[PDB]
Design an enzyme around this catalytic site. Structure first.
Site, PDB file in Angstrom:
ATOM      1  N   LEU A 133      71.229 -66.159 -40.831  1.00 28.37           N
ATOM      2  CA  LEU A 133      72.403 -66.015 -41.683  1.00 28.37           C
ATOM      3  C   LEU A 133      73.012 -67.037 -41.816  1.00 28.37           C
ATOM      4  O   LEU A 133      74.000 -67.049 -42.874  1.00 28.37           O
ATOM      5  CB  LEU A 133      73.117 -64.797 -40.792  1.00 28.37           C
ATOM      6  CG  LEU A 133      73.863 -65.229 -39.425  1.00 28.37           C
ATOM      7  CD1 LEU A 133      75.198 -66.053 -39.712  1.00 28.37           C
ATOM      8  CD2 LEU A 133      73.807 -64.342 -38.432  1.00 28.37           C
ATOM      9  N   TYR A 134      72.945 -68.339 -41.358  1.00 27.47           N
ATOM     10  CA  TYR A 134      73.469 -69.310 -41.574  1.00 27.47           C
ATOM     11  C   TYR A 134      72.912 -70.478 -42.724  1.00 27.47           C
ATOM     12  O   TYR A 134      73.358 -71.456 -42.795  1.00 27.47           O
ATOM     13  CB  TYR A 134      73.465 -70.091 -40.233  1.00 27.47           C
ATOM     14  CG  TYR A 134      74.850 -70.793 -39.921  1.00 27.47           C
ATOM     15  CD1 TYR A 134      75.532 -71.744 -40.905  1.00 27.47           C
ATOM     16  CD2 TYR A 134      75.650 -70.747 -38.610  1.00 27.47           C
ATOM     17  CE1 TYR A 134      76.759 -72.117 -40.680  1.00 27.47           C
ATOM     18  CE2 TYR A 134      76.777 -71.489 -38.330  1.00 27.47           C
ATOM     19  CZ  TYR A 134      77.507 -72.105 -39.543  1.00 27.47           C
ATOM     20  OH  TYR A 134      78.765 -72.629 -39.160  1.00 27.47           O
ATOM     21  N   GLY A 167      77.530 -62.863 -37.331  1.00 27.93           N
ATOM     22  CA  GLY A 167      77.744 -64.248 -37.075  1.00 27.93           C
ATOM     23  C   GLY A 167      78.841 -64.503 -35.796  1.00 27.93           C
ATOM     24  O   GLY A 167      78.703 -65.529 -34.946  1.00 27.93           O
ATOM     25  N   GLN A 169      76.491 -78.135 -42.176  1.00 29.86           N
ATOM     26  CA  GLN A 169      75.364 -78.651 -41.937  1.00 29.86           C
ATOM     27  C   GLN A 169      75.027 -79.426 -40.995  1.00 29.86           C
ATOM     28  O   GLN A 169      74.240 -79.547 -40.179  1.00 29.86           O
ATOM     29  CB  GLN A 169      74.815 -79.389 -43.364  1.00 29.86           C
ATOM     30  CG  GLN A 169      73.385 -79.353 -43.721  1.00 29.86           C
ATOM     31  CD  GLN A 169      73.062 -80.619 -44.693  1.00 29.86           C
ATOM     32  OE1 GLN A 169      73.797 -80.983 -45.449  1.00 29.86           O
ATOM     33  NE2 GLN A 169      71.604 -80.606 -44.966  1.00 29.86           N
ATOM     34  N   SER A 189      78.417 -66.865 -32.418  1.00 27.28           N
ATOM     35  CA  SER A 189      79.152 -68.109 -32.569  1.00 27.28           C
ATOM     36  C   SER A 189      79.840 -68.187 -31.354  1.00 27.28           C
ATOM     37  O   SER A 189      79.692 -69.170 -30.673  1.00 27.28           O
ATOM     38  CB  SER A 189      80.060 -68.092 -33.840  1.00 27.28           C
ATOM     39  OG  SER A 189      79.651 -68.168 -34.979  1.00 27.28           O
ATOM     40  N   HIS A 248      73.310 -72.172 -48.600  1.00 22.73           N
ATOM     41  CA  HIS A 248      73.143 -73.001 -49.415  1.00 22.73           C
ATOM     42  C   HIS A 248      73.887 -72.851 -50.795  1.00 22.73           C
ATOM     43  O   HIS A 248      74.017 -73.693 -51.632  1.00 22.73           O
ATOM     44  CB  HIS A 248      71.528 -73.063 -49.833  1.00 22.73           C
ATOM     45  CG  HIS A 248      70.867 -73.509 -48.601  1.00 22.73           C
ATOM     46  ND1 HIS A 248      70.023 -72.813 -47.979  1.00 22.73           N
ATOM     47  CD2 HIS A 248      70.440 -74.864 -48.196  1.00 22.73           C
ATOM     48  CE1 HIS A 248      69.142 -73.396 -46.998  1.00 22.73           C
ATOM     49  NE2 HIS A 248      69.749 -74.605 -47.203  1.00 22.73           N
ATOM     50  N   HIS A 288      72.887 -78.338 -37.299  1.00 15.72           N
ATOM     51  CA  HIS A 288      71.561 -78.825 -37.380  1.00 15.72           C
ATOM     52  C   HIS A 288      71.185 -79.514 -36.046  1.00 15.72           C
ATOM     53  O   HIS A 288      70.288 -79.896 -35.755  1.00 15.72           O
ATOM     54  CB  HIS A 288      71.406 -80.036 -38.420  1.00 15.72           C
ATOM     55  CG  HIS A 288      70.977 -79.324 -39.722  1.00 15.72           C
ATOM     56  ND1 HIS A 288      71.278 -78.382 -40.040  1.00 15.72           N
ATOM     57  CD2 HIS A 288      70.042 -79.509 -40.662  1.00 15.72           C
ATOM     58  CE1 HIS A 288      70.837 -77.808 -41.145  1.00 15.72           C
ATOM     59  NE2 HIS A 288      69.965 -78.592 -41.510  1.00 15.72           N
TER      60      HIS A 288
HETATM   61  C1  HEM Z   1      72.973 -81.267 -48.550  1.00 13.88           C
HETATM   62  C2  HEM Z   1      72.050 -80.431 -49.311  1.00 13.88           C
HETATM   63  C3  HEM Z   1      71.162 -79.464 -48.655  1.00 13.88           C
HETATM   64  C4  HEM Z   1      69.952 -79.723 -48.861  1.00 13.88           C
HETATM   65  C5  HEM Z   1      69.280 -80.382 -49.540  1.00 13.88           C
HETATM   66  C6  HEM Z   1      69.238 -78.629 -47.864  1.00 13.88           C
HETATM   67  C7  HEM Z   1      67.842 -78.411 -47.984  1.00 13.88           C
HETATM   68  C8  HEM Z   1      67.340 -77.744 -46.742  1.00 13.88           C
HETATM   69  C9  HEM Z   1      66.136 -77.729 -46.649  1.00 13.88           C
HETATM   70  C10 HEM Z   1      64.988 -78.314 -47.732  1.00 13.88           C
HETATM   71  C11 HEM Z   1      65.784 -76.771 -45.499  1.00 13.88           C
HETATM   72  C12 HEM Z   1      64.392 -76.558 -44.866  1.00 13.88           C
HETATM   73  C13 HEM Z   1      63.965 -77.756 -44.608  1.00 13.88           C
HETATM   74  C14 HEM Z   1      62.551 -77.493 -43.534  1.00 13.88           C
HETATM   75  O1  HEM Z   1      61.469 -77.310 -43.937  1.00 13.88           O
HETATM   76  O2  HEM Z   1      62.986 -77.409 -42.008  1.00 13.88           O
HETATM   77  C15 HEM Z   1      67.069 -76.609 -45.211  1.00 13.88           C
HETATM   78  C16 HEM Z   1      67.310 -75.924 -43.986  1.00 13.88           C
HETATM   79  C17 HEM Z   1      68.564 -75.376 -43.639  1.00 13.88           C
HETATM   80  N1  HEM Z   1      69.626 -75.660 -44.233  1.00 13.88           N
HETATM   81 FE1  HEM Z   1      69.867 -76.779 -45.843  1.00 13.88          FE
HETATM   82  N2  HEM Z   1      70.029 -78.093 -47.341  1.00 13.88           N
HETATM   83  C18 HEM Z   1      71.497 -78.795 -47.494  1.00 13.88           C
HETATM   84  C19 HEM Z   1      72.753 -78.427 -47.063  1.00 13.88           C
HETATM   85  C20 HEM Z   1      73.046 -77.243 -46.182  1.00 13.88           C
HETATM   86  C21 HEM Z   1      74.235 -76.784 -45.851  1.00 13.88           C
HETATM   87  C22 HEM Z   1      75.545 -77.105 -46.504  1.00 13.88           C
HETATM   88  C23 HEM Z   1      73.873 -75.717 -45.062  1.00 13.88           C
HETATM   89  C24 HEM Z   1      74.733 -74.995 -44.301  1.00 13.88           C
HETATM   90  C25 HEM Z   1      75.103 -74.712 -43.131  1.00 13.88           C
HETATM   91  C26 HEM Z   1      72.570 -75.877 -44.747  1.00 13.88           C
HETATM   92  C27 HEM Z   1      71.917 -74.884 -43.856  1.00 13.88           C
HETATM   93  C28 HEM Z   1      70.529 -75.027 -43.602  1.00 13.88           C
HETATM   94  C29 HEM Z   1      70.026 -74.332 -42.200  1.00 13.88           C
HETATM   95  C30 HEM Z   1      70.499 -73.619 -41.460  1.00 13.88           C
HETATM   96  C31 HEM Z   1      68.803 -74.524 -42.555  1.00 13.88           C
HETATM   97  C32 HEM Z   1      67.624 -74.051 -41.550  1.00 13.88           C
HETATM   98  C33 HEM Z   1      67.402 -75.304 -40.498  1.00 13.88           C
HETATM   99  C34 HEM Z   1      66.171 -75.203 -39.677  1.00 13.88           C
HETATM  100  O3  HEM Z   1      65.976 -74.275 -39.129  1.00 13.88           O
HETATM  101  O4  HEM Z   1      65.685 -76.094 -39.116  1.00 13.88           O
HETATM  102  N3  HEM Z   1      71.979 -76.601 -45.328  1.00 13.88           N
HETATM  103  N4  HEM Z   1      68.134 -77.031 -45.892  1.00 13.88           N
HETATM  104  C1  LIG Z   2      75.505 -72.475 -30.473  1.00 11.23           C
HETATM  105  C2  LIG Z   2      76.906 -72.317 -30.990  1.00 11.23           C
HETATM  106  C3  LIG Z   2      77.105 -71.684 -32.009  1.00 11.23           C
HETATM  107  C4  LIG Z   2      78.680 -71.602 -32.565  1.00 11.23           C
HETATM  108  C5  LIG Z   2      78.681 -71.539 -34.141  1.00 11.23           C
HETATM  109  C6  LIG Z   2      80.091 -71.309 -34.556  1.00 11.23           C
HETATM  110  N1  LIG Z   2      80.118 -70.569 -35.674  1.00 11.23           N
HETATM  111  C7  LIG Z   2      80.110 -70.970 -37.091  1.00 11.23           C
HETATM  112  O1  LIG Z   2      80.001 -72.440 -37.105  1.00 11.23           O
HETATM  113  O2  LIG Z   2      79.975 -70.201 -38.174  1.00 11.23           O
HETATM  114  C8  LIG Z   2      80.239 -68.916 -38.313  1.00 11.23           C
HETATM  115  C9  LIG Z   2      79.136 -67.896 -38.923  1.00 11.23           C
HETATM  116  C10 LIG Z   2      79.307 -66.681 -38.799  1.00 11.23           C
HETATM  117  C11 LIG Z   2      80.572 -66.208 -38.382  1.00 11.23           C
HETATM  118  C12 LIG Z   2      81.595 -66.967 -37.745  1.00 11.23           C
HETATM  119  C13 LIG Z   2      82.766 -66.286 -37.452  1.00 11.23           C
HETATM  120  C14 LIG Z   2      83.558 -65.380 -38.242  1.00 11.23           C
HETATM  121  C15 LIG Z   2      84.618 -64.835 -37.875  1.00 11.23           C
HETATM  122  C16 LIG Z   2      85.349 -65.095 -36.441  1.00 11.23           C
HETATM  123  C17 LIG Z   2      86.441 -64.504 -35.925  1.00 11.23           C
HETATM  124  C18 LIG Z   2      87.042 -65.452 -35.062  1.00 11.23           C
HETATM  125  C19 LIG Z   2      86.101 -63.178 -35.344  1.00 11.23           C
HETATM  126  O3  LIG Z   2      85.781 -63.107 -34.224  1.00 11.23           O
HETATM  127  O4  LIG Z   2      86.461 -61.918 -36.128  1.00 11.23           O
HETATM  128  C20 LIG Z   2      84.603 -65.861 -35.709  1.00 11.23           C
HETATM  129  C21 LIG Z   2      83.441 -66.360 -36.214  1.00 11.23           C
HETATM  130  F1  LIG Z   2      82.626 -67.084 -35.217  1.00 11.23           F
HETATM  131  C22 LIG Z   2      81.338 -68.500 -37.920  1.00 11.23           C
END
Ligand code: HEM
Ligand SMILES: CCCCCCNC(=O)Oc1cccc(-c2ccc([C@H](C)C(=O)O)cc2F)c1
Ligand code: HEM
Ligand SMILES: *[C@@H]1O[C@H](CO)[C@@H](O[C@@H]2O[C@H](CO)[C@@H](O[C@@H]3O[C@H](CO)[C@@H](O)[C@H](O)[C@H]3NC(C)=O)[C@H](O)[C@H]2NC(C)=O)[C@H](O)[C@H]1NC(C)=O
Ligand SMILES: *[C@@H]1O[C@H](CO)[C@@H](O[C@@H]2O[C@H](CO)[C@@H](O[C@@H]3O[C@H](CO)[C@@H](O)[C@H](O)[C@H]3NC(C)=O)[C@H](O)[C@H]2NC(C)=O)[C@H](O)[C@H]1NC(C)=O
Ligand SMILES: CCCCCCNC(=O)Oc1cccc(-c2ccc([C@H](C)C(=O)O)cc2F)c1
Ligand SMILES: CCCCCCCCO[C@@H]1O[C@H](CO)[C@@H](O)[C@H](O)[C@H]1O
Ligand SMILES: CCCCCCCCO[C@@H]1O[C@H](CO)[C@@H](O)[C@H](O)[C@H]1O
Ligand SMILES: CCCCCCCCO[C@@H]1O[C@H](CO)[C@@H](O)[C@H](O)[C@H]1O
Ligand SMILES: CCCCCCCCO[C@@H]1O[C@H](CO)[C@@H](O)[C@H](O)[C@H]1O
Ligand SMILES: *[C@@H]1O[C@H](CO)[C@@H](O)[C@H](O)[C@H]1NC(C)=O
Ligand SMILES: *[C@@H]1O[C@H](CO)[C@@H](O)[C@H](O)[C@H]1NC(C)=O
Ligand SMILES: *[C@@H]1O[C@H](CO)[C@@H](O)[C@H](O)[C@H]1NC(C)=O
Ligand SMILES: *[C@@H]1O[C@H](CO)[C@@H](O)[C@H](O)[C@H]1NC(C)=O
Lengths: 557, 557
Positions: free
Chosen positions: A353-354, A495, A172, A499, A357, A176
């Site tokens: 894809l990331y 991904g 997270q 990445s 949650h 972010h």
């Molecule tokens: C800690 C608890 C978490 C909460 C309560 C939470 C909640 C949220 C919420 C409400 C949003 C949308 C907010 C908005 O309107 O922009 C969001 C976006 C997102 N969250 Fe989570 N999240 C959490 C943890 C995580 C985790 C562990 C990931 C894994 C990577 C994650 C990935 C994302 C991503 C990628 C977005 C999109 C962000 C964006 O486009 O700006 N979040 N999260």
């Molecule tokens: C803008 C910079 C973005 C970097 C994000 C890093 N990636 C990440 O955090 O999550 C992700 C999200 C989705 C897939 C991967 C991932 C999975 C496997 C592999 C191995 C090595 C392969 O190639 O086969 C490499 C990867 F990267 C990482």
């Protein structure tokens, strides 16, 4: 109406209308020719018969542990394989970038306007008869029904790979800085104009916010000490905008680079660790360079922390989630004799894809407390009550949830998951199977093949009818996992290109930047090349506690 | 005080202080090692003994006309040589970019902040004992004295290569899309955030200005017709800001992409020609694509006009000024098997060296009028009185002034020339000889060697004392010309790398863009690949008048 609505062109050939009811495919450099770019050139059918499937390669990388132990200790061999991983994965990404939510053809607007997320596949045109193009119904299934039938958590499903809350909150925190949707403009837009790893989440997106966070002594960021330990400054002391509800005491309104990081204590834990690390590096540089001023100390520490981040992400973070026995390597030098573009634009689909949650647990357990979502959110006093040491001890041993495999989205964030489906449709995403073809995967021929089970497959078939109309985001979360793995095929194969391209496309990886003097000499350079998640926590958390991204790892005595 | 003030590191090694009175050089990938990076590696001394001087190569490229006629008709040979020109010239440019006016070390601020011009050589540090570092006096010579003694025009000196006013105003028009100094911030800053050939001078830097200039029918730009011929719209009809003095009639306040293009009729002539060309291409695309809407017609025409521009700049414009018998080629495909970065950042020094005001004549002659500077400036009614046809006929046969060779800056723009010297000092430019070393040239060992004469050399020696303290900008304009040429060595050997890198670094030259479908199919693609300064004037100026960049070229009967 648009004759390109059926997506007739294969193998990354481009469709162009040539009249109201006709199209032409541009097969340039695809390796194919013919009307729909499907006749392979002689060299292409050879490569096709020799190429192993992703599931074959994944099997090899996750077995024969004894052979990989050999390979990992032969530096030239390890380098050779890592080089191929980088180049073969990067080739899948259009660089310079091409399409975006408003442009299904290349244009100067889509190239030059950095406020857009870019797009790996162009949007379905507005005048297409169906949401996916020509296939399916006039409407996609009710998103609330999709959510409840195959996405929502019943009982918590743990990650078989052992990913913990250190892993979940690192994910997270790290992502972010480059997933920052601009909601004033819409889901296809970003506020992260750096489009990658610039550490704006620690330093601020703008110069003004940065200067409010800085001490202007010794290159350091502003800080305070509470109970002997270092924490971010307050909004009252810095005037930096943060998002906090009305009732938070001013002393608990920590100010950091990213305005939303007060949302959870797990984010503020990493913000605090990296704040401490920046100031640690400042003091090391000042020892080497008593002649340097504050600005050069600040800028050089920032470059070093960018390097540390990429090093840790590749060799600890991606290493863990990959499940591979091959030891991944951060080494810019691997690409100096290759064709590679040192630039990156963040793709919308990468953001989609990331959305991991399902990682989140039912409660957050620290010491002997089990905090609900209601108690955990925006509560920085939890962070001060326990301290970082205790946070690391607890989060290291708390298991995260499985992402693929279905039915594991916690109900506390279901609205975010429904929004993911809705906004995906709003942005006119092409279907799952089109995305699979785009990343050299075989289209699924049924829902049972997609999920590897029967019950969710039957729910999905009732909602969608045709597998060719299945959507990308829900598919990623219900997909059949690899054996004992957190992800399915589509998550890894989409991904990984985003990445690796994102990580190596950074300017500090380019030949003119990747040299000791950029980082203040060999001492600064070495901080990057020996960085690890354990040494990050060891150097900056009291008592140097054991940590790792895996709950299964034994702590030594 | 800074131990790096003497610029001790050679051969593009980087200097870093390692204490108050010590430095270290980073010799990574320079080809040299040792304290100041001057001991050549074995492979390096071989390449050094084999490499011919720039003046040797220039002699070869400007003689043996009969042999080049052979080479020019062997496509693989022509391709091979042009490929080497591109790669060997591009290698001289740091990409991703590095330094700027505020950063003599690499930093994320200098990399990410697009408002800066980048810098080919870092600025002399603030705490250095002298302006150039350690050499010279406490102060550089009075700039007004430099200007008057060796820069100011006495009698007009014509260009021996025959460059005309078509050439001079093309230079001003083309370069003004990427040389746009932000005077609110200072001489080290730019308003052209596209940093290259994006045609913002026709379409506007911002989306808002663009939409005011557009018709939103058929992809076209707004226009008016006067006396049967097409001209830009007015500010009254579009509300686009333009710089015009108070007395200009509203009907003569033409609105175009670049706000300063109302300054001279010669600029407005090219603005008008390119406006006509954009709308011409729109109509051709609409014939191929009756199904397309206004937005796609507009964007695709813009991509085509970017291609046309680069094609003309390389094969007509640079071809003419180069003086070479080898036929230069615009061909992106030449770099697809090479290492090359498709990106560009505009360098401050590139801007400085392109101040070719000696090109300007004493009067502007159209038909039988001889307009003074006072009469020509901001007078668009001159453009309407004569029309473009007459403009082309006159400007094609009016000789421009010689740039190198000294004493040819017209007195009407002397303040601009004095500012060039002053702002250069303000931006803490290193010396001429440091810049020569940076671009693989031998430092001049005397002023007579620099100018190739005696009289100006003696003036300069009295003002500067040491040749190592001579400044870049005045050196470029007094430099000994190549035989019968408009420029000296330093102008070509610095400018060519910036130029070619700038032209090929454009995203339309990258493999994913350079294909017919990007430009609306083979018809659009062909408009780029057959473009020329003659066909641009032929298609868009009444009567299809003869033109060229050389007064010496005979018009056929
Ligand atoms: C800690 C608890 C978490 C909460 C309560 C939470 C909640 C949220 C919420 C409400 C949003 C949308 C907010 C908005 O309107 O922009 C969001 C976006 C997102 N969250 Fe989570 N999240 C959490 C943890 C995580 C985790 C562990 C990931 C894994 C990577 C994650 C990935 C994302 C991503 C990628 C977005 C999109 C962000 C964006 O486009 O700006 N979040 N999260
Ligand atoms: C803008 C910079 C973005 C970097 C994000 C890093 N990636 C990440 O955090 O999550 C992700 C999200 C989705 C897939 C991967 C991932 C999975 C496997 C592999 C191995 C090595 C392969 O190639 O086969 C490499 C990867 F990267 C990482
Ligand atoms: C037509 C007569 C011309 C006049 C009156 C003129 C005048 C000027 C002036 C006054 C400036 C500085 C304006 C400012 O404060 O930003 C300037 C800048 C410049 N001129 Fe000229 N000029 C002319 C033609 C040319 C020509 C033929 C060239 C050759 C390329 C040229 C190249 C430049 C360049 C590169 C700049 C710097 C622009 C910038 O940094 O924004 N000019 N000119
Ligand atoms: C990158 O692309 C974005 C999307 O096209 C651009 O954002 C658009 O900018 C328009 C103005 O340039 C906005 O419209 C204006 O809104 C204001 C107030 O609402 C009105 O006063 C204007 O008249 C109105 N003009 C028009 C033509 O609508 C759009 O609302 C806005 N779109 C979105 C989705 O935010 C960015 O400007 C562009 N960025 C760059 C750097 O070019
Ligand atoms: C790229 O670099 C530029 C040069 O550093 C930045 O421009 C500087 O922005 C400062 C604010 O961010 C300006 O200072 C401010 O001026 C206003 C009004 O004059 C005051 O209200 C502020 O208090 C004051 N703050 C400070 C710290 O001075 C600078 O004047 C300005 N410098 C120049 C030379 O223009 C750009 O902001 C930066 N661009 C990006 C995108 O980061
Ligand atoms: C951002 C895009 C900038 C492109 C500017 C194009 N150059 C230009 O207009 O003027 C300039 C200014 C200075 C030098 C040159 C130049 C001279 C010689 C050569 C030959 C071919 C060689 O390599 O030996 C190439 C050149 F480019 C062009
Ligand atoms: C087994 C020896 C190590 C090989 C590492 C390959 C890492 C990822 O290689 C990937 O394989 C996929 C299937 O072949 C392809 O679809 C991807 O293009 C390729 O990048
Ligand atoms: C000869 C080199 C070793 C080949 C290993 C066997 C090929 C990989 O076997 C894989 O097993 C997976 C189990 O989930 C299946 O999902 C895949 O379809 C299958 O390819
Ligand atoms: C004579 C056959 C054509 C050769 C074209 C060379 C074009 C420019 O080549 C230039 O030559 C200079 C002197 O050697 C070098 O300093 C530059 O690095 C190189 O780019
Ligand atoms: C053997 C290949 C042909 C070599 C041509 C002779 C080398 C170039 O002769 C050049 O003449 C110029 C005249 O102004 C001088 O300025 C240069 O110093 C000199 O190198
Ligand atoms: C191309 O695809 C269309 C459907 O989009 C199909 O009708 C046609 O047969 C295909 N062409 C070839 C040569 O396969
Ligand atoms: C925040 O945590 C503290 C314990 O550290 C607890 O007493 C308090 O009730 C929590 N606040 C909320 C709103 O849950
Ligand atoms: C390096 O340059 C310094 C002057 O800057 C000079 O004194 C010294 O001799 C040089 N070192 C070598 C090995 O040439
Ligand atoms: C502008 O040109 C016209 C001729 O076309 C002339 O009559 C007029 O005096 C000129 N204006 C100025 C201010 O020189």
């Amino acid at each position: 109406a648009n004759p390109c609505c059926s997506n007739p062109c294969q193998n990354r050939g481009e469709c162009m209308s040539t009249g109201f009811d006709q199209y032409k495919c541009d097969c340039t450099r695809t390796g194919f020719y013919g009307e729909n770019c499907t006749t392979p050139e002689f060299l292409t059918r050879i490569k096709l018969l020799l190429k192993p499937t992703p599931n074959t390669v994944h099997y090899i990388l996750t077995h024969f542990k004894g052979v990989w132990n050999i390979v990992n200790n032969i530096p030239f061999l390890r380098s050779l394989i890592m080089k191929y991983v980088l180049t073969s994965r990067s080739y899948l990404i259009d660089s310079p970038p091409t399409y975006n939510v408003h442009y299904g053809y290349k244009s100067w607007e889509a190239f030059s306007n950095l406020s857009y997320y870019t797009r790996a596949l162009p949007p379905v045109a507005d005048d297409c008869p169906t949401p996916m193009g020509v296939k399916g119904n006039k409407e996609l299934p009710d998103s609330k029904e999709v959510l409840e039938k195959v996405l929502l958590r019943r009982e918590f499903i743990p990650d078989p790979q052992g990913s913990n809350m250190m892993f979940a909150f690192f994910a997270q925190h790290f992502t972010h800085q480059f997933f920052k949707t601009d909601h004033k403009r819409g889901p296809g837009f970003t506020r992260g104009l750096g489009h990658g790893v610039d550490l704006n989440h620690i330093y601020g997106e703008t110069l003004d916010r940065q200067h409010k966070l800085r001490l202007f002594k010794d290159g350091k960021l502003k800080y305070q000490v509470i109970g002997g330990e270092v924490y971010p400054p307050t909004v009252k002391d810095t005037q930096v905008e943060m998002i906090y509800p009305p009732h938070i005491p001013e002393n608990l309104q920590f100010a950091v680079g990213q305005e939303v990081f007060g949302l959870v204590p797990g984010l503020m834990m990493y913000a605090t660790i990296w704040l401490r690390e920046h100031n640690r590096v400042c003091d090391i540089l000042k020892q080497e360079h008593p002649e340097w001023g504050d600005e050069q100390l600040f800028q050089t520490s920032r470059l070093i922390l960018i390097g540390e981040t990429i090093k840790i992400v590749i060799e600890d973070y991606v290493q863990h989630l990959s499940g591979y026995h091959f030891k991944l390597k951060f080494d810019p030098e691997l690409l100096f004799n290759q064709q590679f573009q040192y630039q990156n634009r963040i793709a919308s689909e990468f953001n989609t894809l990331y959305h991991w949650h399902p990682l989140l647990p039912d409660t957050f357990n620290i010491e002997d407390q089990e905090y609900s979502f209601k108690q955990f959110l925006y509560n920085n006093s939890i962070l001060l009550e326990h301290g970082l040491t205790q946070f690391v001890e607890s989060f290291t041993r708390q298991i995260a949830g499985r992402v693929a495999g279905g039915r594991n989205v916690p109900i506390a964030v279901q609205a975010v998951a429904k929004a993911s489906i809705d906004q995906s449709r709003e942005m006119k995403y092409q279907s799952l199977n089109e995305y699979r073809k785009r990343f050299s995967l075989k289209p699924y021929t049924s829902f049972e093949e997609l999920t590897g089970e029967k019950e969710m497959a039957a729910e999905l078939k009732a909602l969608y009818s045709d597998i060719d109309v299945m959507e990308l985001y829900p598919a990623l979360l219900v997909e059949k996992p690899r054996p004992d793995a957190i992800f399915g095929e589509t998550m890894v194969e989409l991904g990984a290109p985003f990445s690796l391209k994102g990580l190596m496309g950074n300017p500090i990886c380019s030949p003119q930047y990747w040299k000791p003097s950029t980082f203040g000499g060999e001492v600064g350079f070495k901080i990057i090349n020996t960085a690890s998640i354990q040494s990050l926590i060891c150097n900056n958390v009291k008592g140097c506690p054991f940590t790792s991204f895996n709950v299964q790892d034994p702590q030594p005595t």
